[PDB]
DNA sequence: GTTGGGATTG
DNA sequence: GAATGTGTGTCTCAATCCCAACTT
DNA sequence: TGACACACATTCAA
């Protein structure tokens, strides 16, 4: 509904300029030649090229290329044919033709070799691939097919550019029009004109290779040839080693699901990924090598990766000490968790077990809310908003940031320690209550990692602000900062407020067929050692 | 005719 | 009865087409 | 496009 018909080409020329000035030193010979050559195309053909780069395929029937802004599809496509950037009569493997053509058209083309039953499209290919392994020009499948198919052949450079400008490959160019329409509305940070996503080109190239390995894997191919291509020595850049170490982790998971534990051990062991060490032990155990398992677990319990790894090691060590001759480690006492049982009539009809306990528990002198990590994450997101989106160098390179780029980075707290000391300071004097309504009214709806506007109504915001102790908020917000990925979930299903007694209690509801998860248990027990009001409500039916 | 999942699209 | 492995649904931007599968 | 929580199945060491 915005004016201009060509906005998407304005936006693409826009990103070409931005990579021209910000990434100038990072471009190559072949690449900088592309940005130059692109600017010389007619407006009609530059527009078509942006359409194909923005749609799903690398392959298109001329028929699917109808656009009003560009009059003729065939006319606009010639200057692109000249650079070899768009192929006509490209080569299509059997499977790819099944994408381009309807089942009607495919039925006739292979009309000979389908006699058996009329059957599905996914099924045809299964029975039709052994007959047609080879790939052919579109002309060599049916010689008279008069509709071109186009293959955009320069797409690799475009993803390299998209990756450099955005700094993660999941965001589309559609980020532009959505922001303009006011659909996804982002916070605007003012960062330096020299700040950018990637420093070295070898950083871009490495990200791109890891992305290639999961692409080739989520299709597959064996890892046996993939781990040939991955580096066997850690990456220079920390964020890359983050990405690589995670990739290794997920490959090892796929191994474990195929019951290949001897390889699973080798893979987990060379990933630094969270809980990788644990899956390594549990993998060795699954593969019946108990001797190595026990030694790894003993090594881990000495300086454990996390409270969650402590929590799992507290199960693995004694079982291993069981299948080995060793004396068991008597596990710890737990403070216990405040039990509440409810016998409720049947659904009918569902209506989750959680919602039902919310209506049951409301006194009405009691108010009860369904918020899962919504309320603590959100209050934190509001209070520390000015610290989170603080303009720290290399934390923002574009307009579309939903969270700082350094968010999971280990020293992220330390770099902002100023504004965090200030925002966390508002708990010590009274100023947090007003400050949170201030960031809340001003910043409502803006995309942020922690703030669930959907969840946070006026009633819940001010009920929580006056029933939640300043000091308990200090505790939870400090714990949240200790491991951002590892502590932002586990929180309970419900929180209830008694505003007259300015009390609250958080309640986890477990229907039959759920137990308390490990991270949930950490959250409950952390509160319970701090003498915070949490409780677990287990429901039975009758 | 209906679903229902996808792409596409501003 | 724990403790595991493993499968499923919910978020969605919303509106519109275009197909493939099912149901009449 | 995952991250989360839940639901259900399987396999064990008390
Ligand atoms: Ca829940
Ligand atoms: Ca629950």
Tab-separated table of N, CA, C and O in Angstrom, chain A residues 360-440:
chain	number	residue	atom	x	y	z
A	360	UNK	N	-9.332	-22.361	38.395
A	360	UNK	CA	-9.601	-23.006	39.679
A	360	UNK	C	-9.012	-22.183	40.825
A	360	UNK	O	-9.706	-21.850	41.791
A	361	UNK	N	-7.744	-21.790	40.693
A	361	UNK	CA	-6.983	-21.063	41.710
A	361	UNK	C	-7.399	-19.602	41.917
A	361	UNK	O	-6.831	-18.950	42.797
A	362	UNK	N	-8.308	-19.036	41.131
A	362	UNK	CA	-8.643	-17.625	41.299
A	362	UNK	C	-9.767	-17.434	42.340
A	362	UNK	O	-10.895	-17.881	42.119
A	363	UNK	N	-9.453	-16.749	43.467
A	363	UNK	CA	-10.251	-16.738	44.735
A	363	UNK	C	-11.627	-16.046	44.812
A	363	UNK	O	-12.462	-16.527	45.573
A	364	UNK	N	-11.885	-14.897	44.126
A	364	UNK	CA	-11.313	-13.812	43.305
A	364	UNK	C	-10.422	-12.843	44.050
A	364	UNK	O	-9.803	-12.013	43.377
A	365	UNK	N	-10.401	-12.885	45.386
A	365	UNK	CA	-9.359	-12.137	46.070
A	365	UNK	C	-7.950	-12.546	45.639
A	365	UNK	O	-6.969	-11.928	46.072
A	366	UNK	N	-7.847	-13.578	44.806
A	366	UNK	CA	-6.629	-14.035	44.149
A	366	UNK	C	-6.729	-13.786	42.646
A	366	UNK	O	-7.784	-14.026	42.055
A	367	UNK	N	-5.689	-13.197	42.053
A	367	UNK	CA	-5.580	-13.042	40.598
A	367	UNK	C	-4.531	-14.024	40.076
A	367	UNK	O	-3.484	-14.175	40.698
A	368	UNK	N	-4.802	-14.716	38.963
A	368	UNK	CA	-3.876	-15.730	38.438
A	368	UNK	C	-3.635	-15.533	36.932
A	368	UNK	O	-4.583	-15.333	36.160
A	369	UNK	N	-2.360	-15.653	36.509
A	369	UNK	CA	-1.940	-15.423	35.126
A	369	UNK	C	-1.124	-16.589	34.557
A	369	UNK	O	-0.306	-17.186	35.274
A	370	UNK	N	-1.325	-16.881	33.241
A	370	UNK	CA	-0.508	-17.840	32.482
A	370	UNK	C	0.571	-17.060	31.766
A	370	UNK	O	0.322	-16.419	30.750
A	371	UNK	N	1.779	-17.169	32.285
A	371	UNK	CA	2.955	-16.509	31.764
A	371	UNK	C	4.121	-17.483	31.919
A	371	UNK	O	4.416	-17.912	33.037
A	372	UNK	N	4.777	-17.872	30.836
A	372	UNK	CA	5.889	-18.807	31.010
A	372	UNK	C	7.136	-18.064	30.588
A	372	UNK	O	7.322	-17.773	29.402
A	373	UNK	N	7.953	-17.700	31.562
A	373	UNK	CA	9.179	-16.942	31.340
A	373	UNK	C	8.797	-15.643	30.663
A	373	UNK	O	9.690	-14.866	30.306
A	374	UNK	N	7.493	-15.459	30.397
A	374	UNK	CA	7.025	-14.200	29.851
A	374	UNK	C	7.183	-13.066	30.844
A	374	UNK	O	7.619	-11.969	30.490
A	375	UNK	N	6.890	-13.323	32.111
A	375	UNK	CA	6.827	-12.171	32.974
A	375	UNK	C	8.227	-11.757	33.405
A	375	UNK	O	8.560	-10.574	33.323
A	376	UNK	N	9.099	-12.698	33.775
A	376	UNK	CA	10.439	-12.296	34.225
A	376	UNK	C	11.283	-11.803	33.058
A	376	UNK	O	11.935	-10.757	33.147
A	377	UNK	N	11.288	-12.538	31.945
A	377	UNK	CA	11.952	-12.008	30.761
A	377	UNK	C	11.451	-10.611	30.429
A	377	UNK	O	12.241	-9.738	30.063
A	378	UNK	N	10.143	-10.381	30.505
A	378	UNK	CA	9.650	-9.090	30.058
A	378	UNK	C	10.062	-7.973	31.002
A	378	UNK	O	10.612	-6.960	30.554
A	379	UNK	N	9.840	-8.141	32.311
A	379	UNK	CA	10.245	-7.082	33.237
A	379	UNK	C	11.730	-6.768	33.055
A	379	UNK	O	12.120	-5.595	32.996
A	380	UNK	N	12.564	-7.803	32.892
A	380	UNK	CA	13.979	-7.572	32.617
A	380	UNK	C	14.146	-6.784	31.332
A	380	UNK	O	14.860	-5.777	31.295
A	381	UNK	N	13.452	-7.194	30.278
A	381	UNK	CA	13.618	-6.520	29.006
A	381	UNK	C	13.266	-5.056	29.082
A	381	UNK	O	13.934	-4.216	28.468
A	382	UNK	N	12.275	-4.721	29.900
A	382	UNK	CA	11.889	-3.330	30.026
A	382	UNK	C	12.943	-2.557	30.803
A	382	UNK	O	13.488	-1.569	30.299
A	383	UNK	N	13.316	-3.053	31.992
A	383	UNK	CA	14.196	-2.294	32.876
A	383	UNK	C	15.561	-2.057	32.244
A	383	UNK	O	16.122	-0.954	32.327
A	384	UNK	N	16.115	-3.078	31.618
A	384	UNK	CA	17.431	-3.007	31.014
A	384	UNK	C	17.388	-2.672	29.534
A	384	UNK	O	18.405	-2.845	28.848
A	385	UNK	N	16.223	-2.263	29.019
A	385	UNK	CA	16.102	-1.915	27.604
A	385	UNK	C	17.240	-1.008	27.151
A	385	UNK	O	17.892	-1.274	26.135
A	386	UNK	N	17.499	0.072	27.898
A	386	UNK	CA	18.498	1.036	27.447
A	386	UNK	C	19.904	0.439	27.470
A	386	UNK	O	20.781	0.904	26.729
A	387	UNK	N	20.130	-0.591	28.284
A	387	UNK	CA	21.409	-1.286	28.279
A	387	UNK	C	21.509	-2.310	27.153
A	387	UNK	O	22.593	-2.499	26.587
A	388	UNK	N	20.389	-2.957	26.805
A	388	UNK	CA	20.389	-4.034	25.808
A	388	UNK	C	20.701	-3.497	24.413
A	388	UNK	O	21.614	-3.973	23.718
A	389	UNK	N	19.990	-2.455	24.015
A	389	UNK	CA	20.124	-1.836	22.715
A	389	UNK	C	21.167	-0.741	22.738
A	389	UNK	O	21.203	0.105	21.832
A	390	UNK	N	21.961	-0.680	23.797
A	390	UNK	CA	23.025	0.299	23.820
A	390	UNK	C	23.899	0.119	22.581
A	390	UNK	O	24.094	-0.989	22.076
A	391	UNK	N	24.474	1.215	22.140
A	391	UNK	CA	25.039	1.397	20.820
A	391	UNK	C	26.467	0.830	20.687
A	391	UNK	O	27.233	1.321	19.850
A	392	UNK	N	26.861	-0.107	21.549
A	392	UNK	CA	28.188	-0.735	21.568
A	392	UNK	C	28.700	-1.107	20.182
A	392	UNK	O	27.937	-1.631	19.361
A	393	UNK	N	29.966	-0.825	19.875
A	393	UNK	CA	30.483	-1.076	18.520
A	393	UNK	C	30.421	-2.540	18.094
A	393	UNK	O	30.864	-3.436	18.816
A	394	UNK	N	29.959	-2.751	16.852
A	394	UNK	CA	29.733	-4.052	16.243
A	394	UNK	C	28.525	-4.810	16.744
A	394	UNK	O	28.307	-5.951	16.317
A	395	UNK	N	27.749	-4.225	17.651
A	395	UNK	CA	26.493	-4.805	18.085
A	395	UNK	C	25.345	-4.453	17.171
A	395	UNK	O	24.298	-5.084	17.260
A	396	UNK	N	25.456	-3.397	16.383
A	396	UNK	CA	24.434	-3.113	15.384
A	396	UNK	C	25.068	-2.646	14.078
A	396	UNK	O	25.829	-1.674	14.082
A	397	UNK	N	24.859	-3.400	12.987
A	397	UNK	CA	25.238	-2.953	11.646
A	397	UNK	C	24.085	-2.642	10.681
A	397	UNK	O	24.372	-2.263	9.539
A	398	UNK	N	22.809	-2.813	11.043
A	398	UNK	CA	21.740	-2.536	10.105
A	398	UNK	C	20.485	-2.149	10.852
A	398	UNK	O	20.488	-2.139	12.110
A	399	UNK	N	19.420	-1.722	10.169
A	399	UNK	CA	18.167	-1.276	10.809
A	399	UNK	C	17.266	-2.365	11.360
A	399	UNK	O	16.237	-2.055	11.976
A	400	UNK	N	17.511	-3.604	11.001
A	400	UNK	CA	16.601	-4.702	11.244
A	400	UNK	C	16.967	-5.562	12.455
A	400	UNK	O	16.508	-6.702	12.543
A	401	UNK	N	17.842	-5.075	13.344
A	401	UNK	CA	18.227	-5.823	14.539
A	401	UNK	C	17.112	-5.885	15.582
A	401	UNK	O	16.673	-4.866	16.142
A	402	UNK	N	16.685	-7.116	15.849
A	402	UNK	CA	15.761	-7.449	16.915
A	402	UNK	C	16.446	-7.618	18.258
A	402	UNK	O	15.783	-7.564	19.294
A	403	UNK	N	17.728	-7.921	18.264
A	403	UNK	CA	18.505	-7.950	19.491
A	403	UNK	C	19.939	-7.609	19.140
A	403	UNK	O	20.351	-7.767	17.987
A	404	UNK	N	20.725	-7.140	20.085
A	404	UNK	CA	22.132	-6.889	19.777
A	404	UNK	C	22.796	-8.141	19.249
A	404	UNK	O	22.362	-9.252	19.518
A	405	UNK	N	23.822	-7.955	18.438
A	405	UNK	CA	24.484	-9.112	17.864
A	405	UNK	C	25.340	-9.825	18.886
A	405	UNK	O	25.636	-11.006	18.714
A	406	UNK	N	25.761	-9.139	19.934
A	406	UNK	CA	26.647	-9.734	20.921
A	406	UNK	C	25.893	-10.385	22.065
A	406	UNK	O	26.509	-10.713	23.078
A	407	UNK	N	24.569	-10.556	21.928
A	407	UNK	CA	23.704	-10.956	23.047
A	407	UNK	C	24.165	-12.213	23.763
A	407	UNK	O	24.204	-12.242	24.996
A	408	UNK	N	24.531	-13.254	23.035
A	408	UNK	CA	24.969	-14.453	23.726
A	408	UNK	C	26.456	-14.432	23.995
A	408	UNK	O	26.952	-15.375	24.618
A	409	UNK	N	27.153	-13.369	23.569
A	409	UNK	CA	28.598	-13.238	23.751
A	409	UNK	C	28.952	-13.142	25.225
A	409	UNK	O	28.247	-12.525	26.021
A	410	UNK	N	30.111	-13.697	25.559
A	410	UNK	CA	30.362	-14.027	26.946
A	410	UNK	C	30.535	-12.784	27.796
A	410	UNK	O	30.120	-12.765	28.963
A	411	UNK	N	31.150	-11.742	27.247
A	411	UNK	CA	31.382	-10.517	28.001
A	411	UNK	C	30.314	-9.448	27.748
A	411	UNK	O	30.452	-8.330	28.256
A	412	UNK	N	29.243	-9.783	27.013
A	412	UNK	CA	28.143	-8.874	26.696
A	412	UNK	C	27.715	-8.039	27.883
A	412	UNK	O	27.488	-6.834	27.736
A	413	UNK	N	27.622	-8.659	29.062
A	413	UNK	CA	27.301	-7.898	30.263
A	413	UNK	C	28.369	-6.857	30.527
A	413	UNK	O	28.068	-5.673	30.692
A	414	UNK	N	29.634	-7.274	30.487
A	414	UNK	CA	30.717	-6.393	30.902
A	414	UNK	C	30.805	-5.142	30.024
A	414	UNK	O	30.980	-4.032	30.547
A	415	UNK	N	30.653	-5.290	28.698
A	415	UNK	CA	30.714	-4.132	27.800
A	415	UNK	C	29.670	-3.058	28.134
A	415	UNK	O	29.908	-1.869	27.898
A	416	UNK	N	28.502	-3.438	28.625
A	416	UNK	CA	27.460	-2.469	28.944
A	416	UNK	C	27.410	-2.127	30.425
A	416	UNK	O	26.494	-1.411	30.864
A	417	UNK	N	28.387	-2.631	31.197
A	417	UNK	CA	28.298	-2.685	32.655
A	417	UNK	C	27.868	-1.362	33.243
A	417	UNK	O	27.351	-1.320	34.367
A	418	UNK	N	28.124	-0.273	32.524
A	418	UNK	CA	27.604	1.028	32.902
A	418	UNK	C	26.079	1.021	32.992
A	418	UNK	O	25.494	1.044	34.085
A	419	UNK	N	25.428	0.921	31.835
A	419	UNK	CA	23.989	1.082	31.804
A	419	UNK	C	23.326	-0.041	32.573
A	419	UNK	O	22.207	0.138	33.063
A	420	UNK	N	24.006	-1.192	32.694
A	420	UNK	CA	23.474	-2.294	33.490
A	420	UNK	C	23.596	-2.022	34.981
A	420	UNK	O	22.707	-2.390	35.756
A	421	UNK	N	24.705	-1.410	35.405
A	421	UNK	CA	24.800	-0.987	36.793
A	421	UNK	C	23.736	0.041	37.112
A	421	UNK	O	23.238	0.073	38.238
A	422	UNK	N	23.349	0.860	36.124
A	422	UNK	CA	22.351	1.923	36.310
A	422	UNK	C	20.931	1.385	36.370
A	422	UNK	O	20.128	1.755	37.249
A	423	UNK	N	20.607	0.550	35.390
A	423	UNK	CA	19.294	-0.057	35.296
A	423	UNK	C	19.063	-1.031	36.449
A	423	UNK	O	18.009	-1.007	37.093
A	424	UNK	N	20.034	-1.907	36.725
A	424	UNK	CA	19.946	-2.727	37.934
A	424	UNK	C	19.998	-1.877	39.206
A	424	UNK	O	19.486	-2.288	40.255
A	425	UNK	N	20.624	-0.703	39.133
A	425	UNK	CA	20.586	0.239	40.242
A	425	UNK	C	19.184	0.691	40.589
A	425	UNK	O	18.862	0.891	41.757
A	426	UNK	N	18.324	0.852	39.586
A	426	UNK	CA	16.955	1.261	39.911
A	426	UNK	C	16.219	0.295	40.838
A	426	UNK	O	15.106	0.617	41.254
A	427	UNK	N	16.734	-0.902	41.106
A	427	UNK	CA	16.092	-1.739	42.119
A	427	UNK	C	16.396	-1.273	43.534
A	427	UNK	O	15.607	-1.528	44.455
A	428	UNK	N	17.522	-0.598	43.722
A	428	UNK	CA	17.966	-0.268	45.064
A	428	UNK	C	17.210	0.939	45.639
A	428	UNK	O	16.723	0.869	46.772
A	429	UNK	N	17.088	2.045	44.882
A	429	UNK	CA	16.087	3.088	45.133
A	429	UNK	C	14.737	2.666	44.542
A	429	UNK	O	14.553	1.528	44.111
A	430	UNK	N	13.754	3.567	44.537
A	430	UNK	CA	12.413	3.178	44.088
A	430	UNK	C	12.137	3.218	42.589
A	430	UNK	O	11.066	2.770	42.152
A	431	UNK	N	13.074	3.747	41.800
A	431	UNK	CA	12.808	4.261	40.461
A	431	UNK	C	12.414	3.202	39.444
A	431	UNK	O	12.019	3.561	38.329
A	432	UNK	N	12.503	1.922	39.787
A	432	UNK	CA	12.272	0.896	38.784
A	432	UNK	C	10.807	0.838	38.387
A	432	UNK	O	10.492	0.661	37.212
A	433	UNK	N	9.897	1.018	39.343
A	433	UNK	CA	8.474	0.933	39.035
A	433	UNK	C	8.079	1.932	37.954
A	433	UNK	O	7.450	1.560	36.964
A	434	UNK	N	8.413	3.209	38.130
A	434	UNK	CA	8.138	4.177	37.071
A	434	UNK	C	8.976	3.922	35.820
A	434	UNK	O	8.485	4.104	34.702
A	435	UNK	N	10.228	3.479	35.973
A	435	UNK	CA	11.100	3.344	34.804
A	435	UNK	C	10.576	2.311	33.830
A	435	UNK	O	10.754	2.446	32.612
A	436	UNK	N	9.954	1.270	34.366
A	436	UNK	CA	9.440	0.168	33.583
A	436	UNK	C	8.180	0.595	32.869
A	436	UNK	O	8.000	0.289	31.693
A	437	UNK	N	7.305	1.351	33.533
A	437	UNK	CA	6.190	1.920	32.789
A	437	UNK	C	6.683	2.913	31.748
A	437	UNK	O	6.025	3.096	30.722
A	438	UNK	N	7.858	3.521	31.960
A	438	UNK	CA	8.397	4.450	30.964
A	438	UNK	C	8.887	3.721	29.718
A	438	UNK	O	8.442	4.019	28.594
A	439	UNK	N	9.769	2.736	29.885
A	439	UNK	CA	10.162	1.993	28.701
A	439	UNK	C	8.954	1.300	28.086
A	439	UNK	O	8.890	1.161	26.868
A	440	UNK	N	7.953	0.941	28.896
A	440	UNK	CA	6.792	0.196	28.388
A	440	UNK	C	5.897	1.046	27.510
A	440	UNK	O	5.409	0.568	26.485
